Amino acid sequence: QHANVVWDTPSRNSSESMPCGGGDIGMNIWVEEGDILFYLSRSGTFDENNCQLKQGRFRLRLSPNPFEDAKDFRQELKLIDGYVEISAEGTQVQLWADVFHPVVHIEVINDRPLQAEIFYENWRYQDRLIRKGEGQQCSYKWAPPKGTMTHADFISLEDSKRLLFYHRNAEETVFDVAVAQQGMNEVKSQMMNPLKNLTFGGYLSGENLEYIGTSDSVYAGTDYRAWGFRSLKASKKHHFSVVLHTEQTETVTQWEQGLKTAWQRIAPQGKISSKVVSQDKKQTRLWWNAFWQRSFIETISDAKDALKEITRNYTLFRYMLGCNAYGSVPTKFNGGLFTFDPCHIDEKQAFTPDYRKWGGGTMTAQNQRLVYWPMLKSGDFDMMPSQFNFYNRMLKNAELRSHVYWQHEGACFCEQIENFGLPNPAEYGFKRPAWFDKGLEYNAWLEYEWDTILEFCQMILETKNYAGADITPYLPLIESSLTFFDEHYRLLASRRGRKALDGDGHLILFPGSACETYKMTNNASSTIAALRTVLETYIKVCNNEKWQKMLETIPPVPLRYIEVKPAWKQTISPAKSWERINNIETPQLYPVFPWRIYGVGKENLEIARDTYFYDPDALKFRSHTGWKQDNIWAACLGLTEEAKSLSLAKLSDGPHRFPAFWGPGYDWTPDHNWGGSGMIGLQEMLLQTNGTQILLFPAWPKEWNVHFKLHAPGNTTVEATLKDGKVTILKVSPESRKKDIVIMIE
């Protein structure tokens, strides 16, 4: 038992919008001065500058409008069935997306016959020059070449099919620019190109509609054109469909064809088969019903109000993640699929609705990982490949890097990575010395940060461990990723000295970095904990000995002493050595999470706790904002009250009307690494794994009553309840695992 989001009065602007999606599609939906407005974003729609374009904005007006000064207004997110419902006296509108097909549906049911106008609004009707600061939404960031523009869409007026909109990419894209910049033209002809000719759009369609002409205005400081359709005859029912298609094609004909094929499915002889759309609808709702059975964290005086808040928000976010199961590319951290008009976020950055900070086809690994990690314990295993394929798609490209720059095998996956496997052109350096290594970013924050891929590698393996997933398509990726660290730091040492290993026969991890925070490291704890834990884990799943050899070559995690404001405390060191500090991450707790070397029910917990409580960089960097993992670590170290405080802070209502729209923090709104991280935190307070143990309530307060169900390794599922400090229930499946449970509530 939980709660939907119910607004009983209309919304003022696009920031006061509601998420709704499914499949690879996300809509922001709201009602403003009697109009039903929805933005429509789909995963993977990257322009020639690698900006994530929204497909458009949709407007629905009824006449006489029952939403004008309406009594009994109600916009409701109907979680269980994954659809939004807007209703007022004798009218009921439903919006949903098919989970199994790229199609949005609007349904109107009126007691009396009403008239309906539907408008398709597109602000890319003509070329628009990228203004100062607008580059952040693309790969050029702060330095878009003079005369760089967002190219125009192709709208046109030709069954029930009415309107055709699409954007098409040219042959020349930021890919070709970046290939040149980083000197890989030699091997360009062997590289996957995600952007060349990439085309994406669809049909607006309905029965009982005529065209009512074009019209021009401004929505949120953004000029736009609108095409309008009006129903020939008033009617008790009205049904509109939007049908999308995405593809790289030699001609526009080829693309159109694929769109037609998708359109025919739902309109076999030109009309929208309400038989077919009923199956689609039924399927979709079952899927959502199943969705809310995979996992949950629910409740059962303002203490309870606050718990309800975070559990509610935890859930609302999970909905948002759900909207992009089966995306070809992952839910992005910086807005996801639910960006709105920038001006509501920052007036200095008031650009098109296609705008967000930190790029579109450009995705920072450290953020992306926080979106996905929580999908293991929530059982959302089928969504995670969206994230895995992103990297698998560019494995050949990331390898050709290492071939070109250092003539060795293995994939070089930079931190701020494009969808084509090279680092972001801007961060690589536009004004860089001729002599500098072509494989290295001319960058103080990013140089030698290649280790986040290993977190995704761990995710892949953990899908096997948690859900028996078939991960055969990924093994090459995992192997190539490890091969790099071995072949790189061997070669670097052999070029510098006579020995390629240290005197303990271990790898010499220099130059490295501990995330983006400690730079030019020797033997960072973060990178080590990773190689150790990935290899340990990949050994259990591969008899080959090359991997046990390499595990023996991994140096130990470095520790150190710190004085306390005497007495000395022993903590985890950032690294054996570093040159400087350029950020506010805390990679000396990466052995706590993600790699779970230290943690509850594991050795030397006192070391980790002291790192959390006394490392003065960690103290200084502690926070609940954005990606800050202090909430996670607190929980993994069994510090309730600390975890309680942070998780309260992290998951409490965001600044917009929908309460799980958090941001912008260090990123963009809706911040998804905010949600993601926050999920992780709540999850770890309840359930942790320690070998084959399942530790329940490791960092959960007695006075928080809870009913949850989370996953654990070996297709295991734990449903439990705490009430007035008693574990009143336990339902465990398979039952053989019930004896592995350890209750920790004291």
Side-chain angles (χ1 to χ4, degrees), residues 577-616:
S577 71
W578 58 97
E579 293 183 8
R580 62 195 189 250
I581 312 182
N582 305 21
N583 219 310
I584 57 174
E585 300 160 295
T586 314
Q588 53 274 54
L589 286 169
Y590 264 40
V592 175
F593 177 98
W595 303 114
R596 298 169 193 287
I597 285 167
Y598 298 70
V600 169
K602 305 164 209 282
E603 317 197 69
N604 295 303
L605 176 68
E606 282 310 304
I607 286 176
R609 288 182 171 199
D610 290 344
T611 312
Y612 179 91
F613 271 135
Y614 296 119
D615 186 308

Side-chain angles (χ1 to χ4, degrees), residues 366-395:
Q366 184 280 140
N367 307 86
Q368 285 309 137
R369 62 83 190 221
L370 285 165
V371 172
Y372 271 78
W373 266 135
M375 290 180 188
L376 289 176
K377 294 197 192 188
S378 59
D380 292 302
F381 313 110
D382 52 358
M383 318 206 294
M384 303 193 64
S386 30
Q387 174 67 88
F388 306 149
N389 298 317
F390 186 47
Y391 274 110
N392 201 29
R393 247 255 268 200
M394 55 188 176
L395 177 54

Side-chain angles (χ1 to χ4, degrees), residues 217-278:
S217 190
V218 155
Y219 179 58
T222 323
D223 60 297
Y224 74 89
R225 172 161 298 149
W227 293 253
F229 299 82
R230 195 162 166 75
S231 45
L232 296 158
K233 301 173 177 184
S235 178
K236 305 145 157 282
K237 270 205 272 181
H238 298 275
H239 183 94
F240 318 101
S241 279
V242 186
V243 175
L244 305 171
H245 181 80
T246 297
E247 217 188 316
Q248 291 172 289
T249 55
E250 273 206 346
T251 65
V252 195
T253 302
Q254 287 155 49
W255 178 83
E256 190 159 67
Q257 185 163 353
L259 177 54
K260 284 157 170 284
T261 313
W263 159 247
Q264 288 164 4
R265 189 188 65 71
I266 69 157
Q269 288 165 110
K271 281 215 169 187
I272 304 171
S273 173
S274 89
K275 152 261 164 74
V276 156
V277 159
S278 268

Side-chain angles (χ1 to χ4, degrees), residues 276-337:
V276 156
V277 159
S278 268
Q279 287 151 188
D280 289 8
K281 181 187 278 207
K282 189 197 179 194
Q283 289 307 306
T284 281
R285 300 190 175 202
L286 298 182
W287 185 94
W288 280 108
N289 302 333
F291 193 85
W292 297 106
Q293 287 311 303
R294 312 210 271 197
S295 83
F296 49 82
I297 309 177
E298 301 170 348
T299 57
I300 41 168
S301 193
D302 295 41
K304 340 276 106 270
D305 290 12
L307 186 51
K308 263 168 265 140
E309 203 185 304
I310 59 173
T311 63
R312 194 185 63 228
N313 292 348
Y314 169 92
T315 305
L316 292 169
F317 185 70
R318 198 179 156 241
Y319 176 76
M320 300 164 53
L321 294 171
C323 296
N324 187 46
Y326 325 128
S328 53
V329 307
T331 309
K332 288 169 51 68
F333 70 105
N334 57 325
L337 283 170

Side-chain angles (χ1 to χ4, degrees), residues 19-30:
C20 175
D24 56 9
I25 290 167
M27 302 176 288
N28 310 66
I29 290 173
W30 76 105

